[PDB]
Structure formats: C-alpha cells, structure tokens
Curated annotation (Swiss-Prot):
This is Dipeptide-binding protein DppE. Disruption phenotype: A null mutation abolishes the ability of a proline auxotroph to grow in a medium containing the dipeptide Pro-Gly as sole proline source. Gene3D superfamilies: Dipeptide-binding Protein, Domain 1, Dipeptide-binding Protein, Domain 3, Periplasmic binding protein-like II. It is found in: Cell membrane. Its main location: membrane. It is a lipid-anchor. Belongs to the bacterial solute-binding protein 5 family. PROSITE patterns: PROKAR_LIPOPROTEIN, SBP_BACTERIAL_5. GO terms for biological process: peptide transport; protein transport; sporulation resulting in formation of a cellular spore. InterPro entries: Peptide/Ni-bd, SBP_5, SBP_5_CS, SBP_5_dom. PANTHER family: DIPEPTIDE-BINDING PROTEIN DPPE, PERIPLASMIC BINDING COMPONENT OF ABC TRANSPORTER. Probably part of the ABC transporter DppBCDE involved in dipeptide transport.
Length: 501
C-alpha cells in the first residue's frame, strides 16, 4: 500500500468549496474535488470535469462539454447543473463567501452578489446535463485557470438540498476528485483514498494520502526524520546544513514580501525620498543573511510564476526595475530633503505584524537604512488582525506587506495599484497607470496586453510607493521515494500524478 504522509498543520476551516479561501482548507480540498479544468504538471489548465470547450467570436462566451463518464462518489453523474448550482451559490449575497469576488468574472455575478441584480441574470447556464454556457463580463484568456480554483468547484445539488452540511464530515461528503475523503478526525487527521468513481483513476498511483495537523515546526521535523512525514518544512535553525541536500524541493510561489509607503504622510510625499529608501535596500543581503530559505530577491513588483504568450516568465522577461545603489540612494535623499526644506527627516515608524520573521526583516531594514542613508526609523509591531485593518485605513507611514495573487495572470498584481483600489493602501494615484490598466483589460491581442502590463509595472516601480523585498517560494524536505507532486505558482497542491516507489 502506497501511502503519502503530509502535514496540513491545522484543521481545514471549511470543505464547503467557496468558504475556506485558504491553504488549510483548499490544499486537501483540491484533491477530493475537481473543477472544469485542473492545472497540469506545466501549470496550464487542462480538461478535468470539462472534456473540451469552445469560445465565442467576442471571446466572452464559453461552452463547456462535461465529460460523459464524470461521477460523484455516490455514483451520481457530474452534470452541468451541478456547476450552475455551485457558481450561483458561491455568489449568493446571503452566503457571504470570502471567495465570491472570483465569481464577479461571470456576467451579472457582482450585481447578484451585491443584492442589486437577479440570480437568473448571472450568465452561467446548464443548457443540458452535458453543456455549460458561461458569459464573462469581459474577455479574460486566463478564465480557464480561474475555473480550476476551488471557488468554482461543483456541488452535488441533490446532496446539498438533502443535507446542507454534507461537507462538514467525511461520512456525508460527496466529492468528484482523484481521491475520496474516507476519514476526518477534526483537529487530528484526514485520510483520503484513491477514488473508484473517478474518471481518471488509472492515472492515480497512490493508494492513500494521510494529512497530519501538527503546527509545531519542531515536531514537523522530527516526523520527517522518523519517516512519519514524507514531506516537511526545512527547520530554520538547520537551514545552512540542510538547504543544499538532494532531498530539498524548491519551487516558485507567486507573491511578494514588500513594504508600503503612505505617499500622503511626510516624508513620503516626496518621490526622491521614497526612491532613496527603495534604492538603499539590498534584497540580496536580506535573503542571504536574514531569511535564508533561498527566496529570490525582488527588484520588481510582479513575482516569478506567470507565463507569457511566448512561454517566458513575466518577471524574467521584464527584468530588474530597481537596482540597489547606496551612493545614488544618498544623492536622491539629499535632493528630496532639499526640495522639502528638511534639515532632518520627520520621524519615521516602520510598522509590522508581530511574528519572528517580520521582526528580523524589519530590524535588518532599520539597520540598512541607518548604515546606508544615516536615517533613523523606529519599529512598531502589532497583532495581525489590527495591523491589517489599520493598513487598509492608511494609518501607517511605512509598513510590512504581503501580496499573493488571486488568479493566474499578472493583472492580479497590477490592478492592486490603481487609484483607490482596496489592495493599494499607499495613497498612490497615477492617472497614466490607471489608463494602462484600463487598456490592458480591454486589449484583445495577448502580446500587446503583456506589453501594457510591463509598461505599467515600470511606472509603478519608478515612483516607488513600495519597496520590493523577496519573492515567495515553496521549500520542502521530501522523501526520495516520492515523485510527481505538483505545487503550482498560483493554485493548490496536486497529488493525482504523485507516486511513492
């Protein structure tokens, strides 16, 4: 019996597909449920519940054909109606799903979700049991990746009306993915087994996947050492000894660790002062001496992890947009302080959320700004929830930031810095940038759309409302016997191609 032993760390928030909206829920859920597409080993969407699709001449209307022999674990066929049901449920104004915004891509979805528009005017329709027609608000070539997201998973409508809490327990769960949920001991473990009803069961080579719930990183390592976990985190303490070994897996995760300025709070209303701070930071030093998990230093906003029409990575094709340079940074600071008539900089506080990682990086930033520019910043820390909310409320001059994209396209990053966007949180308000984003969202030629997005990024970095620090990755110790795990830059772990031999 081939059993893959992994650690989920904690109890899933929810297996009701649109609700969890996080790794602890969606990493396992992705392996017991299945959407119209699934991201493959090269991260491109491939046919999953949909055998095939056609797109209308205006690029707005998709017609999915459901696989003829797709089934639920209770033997029921997976139908286009199960998708219509699920997507309208995900958008329901009364359900308050945290992932509902991803449903806004469907025409009528945002209006329905707002309480303004009718359910029937949301353009997802089961034309028959095998045919799902979907009309988008606007053409998006990456919609085929969006429908691999768990928010877009189907729900067996008969099962949901019979037991509206079917997803809360293994014994009532009805799923359609490569594995079947067979045990769920809340706060302890999950077990899933190769699913006999699955259309592609012959591809699935693991008999079972077992998911622990161990949040103690120290116990996580002991369990790897002892063979009780097949995958595990690299202990930070022992990074320098272990990171070089052949059993460490490192892959991209799209996302960015950065700092935000508030461009309306002194002294960061001055572009030269922001640019000086941004150019003083040395991201190579942070990753080499502080984080020490082989993260890529960030010299741009959009991370590795997005493919272009030519097959290149977006970040690789755009290049570095800000280069560390101490002597130039000093000149820019001196120029900005002269513009503002500052004899000394106004007091600056660097605020972060309480966590050891964040404190170490903030202390390194503080020391670097002192050594390279002669500037003093004070540190402040507070609990995550209050920190996050105060950041949204633009309370902080200078604050730790994290961004993870919601979907597999660079526009997910770049739309964040439009004027007044909820993910902006800096006050930065650039009409030229806003126009470029608008043009990108209305551009039919993908190569030109990608150019517009590079143009936008260059303008953002040039005005420095942020300081990029590092790009996210996924680092694991992995049993040499285990092959074929797929961890996507944008999306959730896929185990259906994994083997243990």
């Amino acid at each position: 019996e081939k059993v893959l032993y992994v650690n989920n760390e904690n109890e899933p928030t929810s297996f009701d597909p649109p609700i969890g909206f996080n790794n602890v829920s969606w990493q396992p859920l992705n392996n017991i449920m299945e959407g119209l597409t699934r991201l493959g080993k090269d991260h491109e969407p491939e046919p999953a519940m949909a055998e095939k699709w056609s797109v209308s001449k205006d690029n707005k209307t998709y017609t999915f054909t459901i696989r003829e022999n797709a089934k639920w674990t209770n033997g029921d066929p997976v139908t286009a109606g199960d998708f219509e049901y699920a997507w309208k449920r995900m958008l329901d104004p009364k359900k308050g799903a945290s992932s509902a915004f991803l449903g806004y891509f469907i025409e009528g979805g945002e209006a329905y979700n707002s309480g303004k528009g009718k359910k029937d005017d949301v353009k997802v329709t089961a034309k028959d049991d095998r045919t799902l027609e979907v009309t988008l608000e606007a053409p998006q070539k990456y919609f085929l990746s969006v429908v691999s997201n768990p928010a877009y998973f189907p729900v067996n409508e008969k099962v949901d009306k019979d037991n509206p809490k079917w997803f809360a327990e293994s014994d009532t769960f009805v799923g359609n993915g490569p594995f079947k949920l067979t045990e769920w001991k809340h706060d302890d473990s999950i077990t899933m087994e190769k699913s006999d009803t699955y259309w592609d069961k012959d591809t699935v080579k693991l008999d079972k996947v077992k998911w622990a719930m161990v949040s103690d990183r120290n116990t996580d390592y002991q369990m790897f050492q002892s063979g009780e976990l097949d995958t595990a985190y690299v202990p930070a303490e022992l990074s320098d000894q272990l990171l070089d070994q052949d059993n460490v897996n490192i892959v991209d995760q799209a996302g960015l660790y950065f700092y935000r300025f508030n461009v309306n709070m002194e002294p960061f209303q001055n572009e030269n002062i922001r640019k000086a701070f941004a150019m003083a930071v040395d991201q190579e030093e942070i990753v080499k001496y502080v984080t020490k998990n082989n993260e890529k230093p960030a010299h741009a906003f959009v991370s590795p992890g997005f493919t272009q029409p030519d097959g290149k990575d977006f970040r690789e094709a755009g290049g570095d947009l800000i280069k560390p340079n101490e002597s130039k940074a000093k000149q820019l600071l001196e120029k900005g302080m002269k513009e503002e008539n500052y004899n000394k900089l106004p007091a600056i506080t660097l605020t972060y959320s309480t966590k050891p990682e964040h404190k170490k990086i903030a202390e390194a930033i503080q020391q670097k700004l002192k050594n390279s520019l002669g500037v003093d910043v004070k540190l402040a820390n507070m609990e995550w929830n209050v920190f996050l909310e105060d950041q949204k409320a633009l309370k902080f001059q200078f604050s730790q930031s994290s961004f993870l994209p919601d979907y597999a396209d660079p526009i997910s990053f770049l739309e964040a810095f439009q004027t007044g966007n909820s993910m902006n949180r800096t006050g930065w308000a650039n009409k030229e940038y806003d126009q470029l984003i608008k043009q990108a969202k209305n551009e039919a030629d993908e190569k030109t759309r990608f150019s517009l997005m590079h143009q936008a990024e260059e303008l953002l970095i040039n005005e420095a409302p942020i300081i990029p620090v590092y790009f996210y990755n996924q680092v694991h110790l992995q049993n040499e016997q285990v092959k074929g795990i797929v961890r996507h830059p944008v999306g959730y772990i896929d185990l259906k191609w994994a083997d243990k031999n």
